[PDB]
Amino acid sequence: GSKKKWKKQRKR
Amino acid sequence: VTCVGKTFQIYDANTLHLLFVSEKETPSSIVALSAHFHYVYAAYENKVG
Amino acid sequence: NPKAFPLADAALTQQILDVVQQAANLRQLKKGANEATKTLNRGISEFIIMAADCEPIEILLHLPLLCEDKNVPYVFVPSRVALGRACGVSRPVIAASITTNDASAIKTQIYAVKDKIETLL
Amino acid sequence: SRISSLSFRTDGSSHLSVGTSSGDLIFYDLDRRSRIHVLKNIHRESYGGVTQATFLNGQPIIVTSGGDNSLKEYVFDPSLSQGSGDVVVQPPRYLRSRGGHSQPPSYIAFADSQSHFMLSASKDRSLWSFSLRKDAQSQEMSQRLHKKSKFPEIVALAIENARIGEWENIITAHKDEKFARTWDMRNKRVGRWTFDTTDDGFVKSVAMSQCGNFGFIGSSNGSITIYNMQSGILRKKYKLHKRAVTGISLDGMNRKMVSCGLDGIVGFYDFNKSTLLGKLKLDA
Amino acid sequence: SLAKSPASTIQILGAEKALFRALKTKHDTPKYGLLYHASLVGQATGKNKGKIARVLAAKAAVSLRYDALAEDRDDSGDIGLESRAKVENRLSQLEGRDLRTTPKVVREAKKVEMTEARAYNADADT
Amino acid sequence: DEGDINALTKILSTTYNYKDTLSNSKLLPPKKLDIVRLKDANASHPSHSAIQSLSFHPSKPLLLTGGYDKTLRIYHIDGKTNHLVTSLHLVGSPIQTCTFYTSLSNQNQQNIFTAGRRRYMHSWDLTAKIEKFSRLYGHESTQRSFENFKVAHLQNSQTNSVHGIVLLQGNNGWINILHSTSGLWLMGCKIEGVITDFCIDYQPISRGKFRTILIAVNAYGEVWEFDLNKNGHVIRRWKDQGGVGITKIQVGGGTTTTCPALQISKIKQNRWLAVGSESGFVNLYDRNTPTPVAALDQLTTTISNLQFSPDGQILCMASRAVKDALRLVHLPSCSVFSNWPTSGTPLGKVTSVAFSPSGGLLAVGNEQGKVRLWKLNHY
Amino acid sequence: DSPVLQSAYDPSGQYLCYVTVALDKQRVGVQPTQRWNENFLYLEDSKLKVTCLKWVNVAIILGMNNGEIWLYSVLANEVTYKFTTGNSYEIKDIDLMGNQLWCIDSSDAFYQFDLLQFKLLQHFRIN
Amino acid sequence: EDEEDIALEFINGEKKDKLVNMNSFTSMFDNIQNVQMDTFFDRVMKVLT
């Protein structure tokens, strides 16, 4: 995952 | 045999290594080149060398 | 689509989809019919959401039966695309579940939406 | 299209090579009435494309020439099909060539003390290395950049050999450019460092110390910047000239450094101590 | 009861012994269960057997839970048929894979040696 | 060796080039895009804040930029020098949006409207002749600020006169329509829910007659259609299929803000309609319960910019959440171009996009105040 | 650099003609030196470019990269006539003496033209 | 009327067609056995349509 705390990112 | 301005150069086809170059620069640029065995005929202005 | 009952109205769909989008961010959302089924088996679901337009609708008609037996709230939305949209996935979701968490930061409106769904049923 | 040359294959294959002023060479199988393959842009169209293309008598090797100062040889490999080989004709492959600058060279320099190679830059935006022996070996310096179209033509160039094989040993200046690029003769490839004038000026003078450790860059705005060849890191900056600096030299002793500029003054500096030893003004 | 179950259980319904033993002993779990004897699983090979089992079971629920909860199901099996085609398509592309890398056609770098050839003489013309 | 069935064999012999030359072709290739970068527009004079908005002059070769620096920096874009024409600092007015305007009838009229997070808006006739609009004539409650405003052309059919109108976004589904010159409150329009975005479509009626339609959308996906030639009355209502959290909306294929007209006859209808969302899907609709033609999914963040080519062949869609979040879509194929943008393409946090009326130039602004210019060789 | 790609005073030195780029299109304009004209000739094609500027005694001869020469009247604001060479190569220079008009192409071919007769007189190449 | 108007009208007239991608015809092999080739061409058309 993005893991900025997970950054708001769409799953494709 | 390839023309280079007022002089010509000879390359070996197998290796493209220089073999001979014209001893002197022609008074005029060469227009045509003909090679026949050990002789090459060069044309410039009204003289064929 | 007479089978899907009760079907939330346009306004009611708003708050539900809003909570679903929130629950997605806080990892309190379970997406998919079987994954929704597992929550009901484990009794960890606040309530179950389904999509009315899904064809065949029978693919989700089991969840009402589980929900009624377990006394879990349930409700239907018109569009499955919009459901998967709020879930935060690139594919349509025909059903999803909100996991039970009394320590969550989004608890209050879940109960509020739950209380309305109680009224709808 | 316009035919410029013709030649037949005398190696036992009914093949005809047709050359075009567009720079394209096409091969046609006369027996099968089909096009074998086309070589595109072998020679520049602007310079007449293929001026002459000839099959060697009794060999699968064809020589191609043009006005772009290049001679190339192409060979037709044996078929990889055990049968029906005439159908399965391999495309001609590059074998060897000789070439040089397509336009008159702008700058030259002697590569080594032994005088076996020359560095040459031309307006065709290419830096070339030419042998001075019968081999006539010629190569174009690779411009593929290191990671940390052609570049503009070179206006200045300096070379040293004190530290060849260890790091970059050539510096050049590009027209209308605010930084200098490095070249490495051992690798025949672009260096991994770029030097900027740091004064919003174009590079007009380039020089390197005999030890090969310091690179001297002259800006159009009158500033002189000092870089290290191996680390490419700016070390010192000298600002005496107010106009463009046209010449920069460090004596082999690495003590006294000389500079001159369009303003007409000649600057004398102590490289070790970084002091202005003296200033001389000339008439022009 | 089976229809009420999720697809996850359906694939591993017949290997509870291996399942719960594996869960408690920190060991790999069954992946075929009772569904191993289906024709589609037989067609698959190697690790693809596990894949088709999961895919088949998901569609097994789809086909099943139509049958159980249908008010006016036609006794035709159409949903199963389209479901079957999807799995077959999944199997085909899955089996179409080659884990083993393809070998490239070798083109070795060989060498040409010039050979002298007879040429007609123009002196005879003259 | 020394209709006819062998025709196709002969034509293959004639040429070794079989790809049709795209020069004669006027439809751009579906997947391959021919783009070359040019020099930056602001390189002559940098901006000290983000480029909040970009706008090309309809006819003159001028580009307008705005941002929180509070200056209207206008550049003469030529692709090689891009020098600055003039700049106009507006103290105490952060610039959220700016645009050129030309009266559809009086071509000599040129004006610039700029607004921000304030209860006033400035107009600039073309020392500077600047004027402030700050009176709503009783509708002050509905509006809190003019930060979001678009300019359109309104035809008064009963007199056949044409004039500009300034559109504003209200606090609760409200849209306020003001006179471009007189600033007079002409009409007001309402929708249910929070207004998120709106646009304008023009539908020609006859010779010299056209109607302007306001398209408004709620975050949910209800879309309202208002007839401004009939006192802003509803004319159509429909929902974006699969729509939730709508963010932006725009039309293409005809006249619009990006592609304004010069006379009445040039008015054309838009055949395309696209709608954004915070997640990043864009539902494309063919304006010619509607169903989207395509549902783009390439970007994964909120749709902050969505613009159509003047000819309606390319959709340029961008997002400000992450860097390099810019994609170009071919139409009507609805296929995203692959060759461009690349990893090395400098885009950063895209925040402003602009299409030139002609010549196929792209201007893209970022947070850093850099406007990077490109050319489409197809045009 | 400068926006003015090319410029030229008239022989009297009283009027300056300059060519500049609007978007991807070059525009030609004239202004009065002693002392605003907003009328510019526009090249409708992006590829087209102005290679030569030459005043005439109120017309200016315009050499194109297309391989043809245009005669432009400032007053009318349109090209009155276009002299087209056989070759499409760009014109490198232009010069005038009364009716005599001489141009050169990228092929290094000399050409001669007559303004009164609007004809190509002769074309030749010198080694 | 102007030529650019005709050009834009022609552009508008153009309509979309589904493009051929990587995995469009792989399934043809699965159903290539004992199929009338007319039906094969028809299926190719259907997927192409």
Added chain:
Amino acid sequence: SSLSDQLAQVASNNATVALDRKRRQKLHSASLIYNSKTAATQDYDFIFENASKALEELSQIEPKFAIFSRTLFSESSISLDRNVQTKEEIKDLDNAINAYLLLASSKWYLAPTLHATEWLVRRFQIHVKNTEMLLLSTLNYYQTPVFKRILSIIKLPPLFNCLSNFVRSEKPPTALTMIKLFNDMDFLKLYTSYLDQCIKHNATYTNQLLFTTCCFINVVAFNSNNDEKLNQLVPILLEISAKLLASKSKDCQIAAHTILVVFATALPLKKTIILAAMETILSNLDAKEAKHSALLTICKLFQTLKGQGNVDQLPSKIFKLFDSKFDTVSILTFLDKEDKPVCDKFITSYTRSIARYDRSKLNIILSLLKKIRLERYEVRLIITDLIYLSEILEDKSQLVELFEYFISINEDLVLKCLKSLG
């Protein structure tokens, strides 16, 4: 070159001479019917007996097989060895064997063929010498167990390198890997030549065409992104369609129709190529099913055109050829069916051709327009020529009725065209 490489060539030349005992078992152990141990136990005479009976069964299925009894399956062929045969006599064997594989081409599913082909393998070592012709022939049976048996016994040529993985492998080659072999440009020329012979010999059959068609269409897909290679596919693959179209066989023609459509959708081509494409399609269009496929392929090609002249009238020669093979009633029936593909561009050219060349069919123009909705610009072009017709052609009832049809539909556009033209 190294002595090993130069020596390696020597081994290939005499790979089949059967020098010592050890080499003999490898050569003789090769078998398509039986395993290695039993194969070594066999003798030529026993092989001849089985093969002779097998051909007799094959002869009943197809009389052509009986001829090989005189040359290949003769008793004296038992005493014939290839190693002891001279250069000229060897090609004659190569001609005879190559012919035989072609007649085996449509029958391998039959058991007797394998018995018959065994004798050629064991007597004439075709798997060693005539390797390529055997693979190219059997290529469409790649799921079939026979093909697996081939790979185990045979040394692949350099071009068939992709199949080395499936040699002596339990799984058969996948359809994906077959694409890769065809993707090679060189192999396409091999299969090109092989296919050309079959067309000349009329030996093509559906399963060949089905597999043959199924593959190149994928090669279009696999190269879809890379335009430059797609260009390199034009000379070779289109040339296939030329031969296939020239064939009388309806299956060959319709096969070419499948080929042509996908490239046009895949690649934009010059109209002249597409113009040239039509004449061939229409020149040898005889079978009923061929017209239906052709009348679909024709319109699809016209849909691909996206340049000036997209809907211009067809040439004179093209127009008369088309109507001869497709009467006006037929295309009317084509426009009657509701499931018609998009064909507006073809019709617009077709209608303009009618006006240019025939005065009688104008009343069909009215019917054609009603059936199909044409594009906005396309209608305008139809206005433009018909205006010229009124000025040139004498005013007819059908002519004015055509005007009246457009007066009813979009009256304003009629004025614009009239305004622009007079």
Added chain:
RNA sequence: GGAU
């Protein structure tokens, strides 16, 4: 597009 980049490393390799």
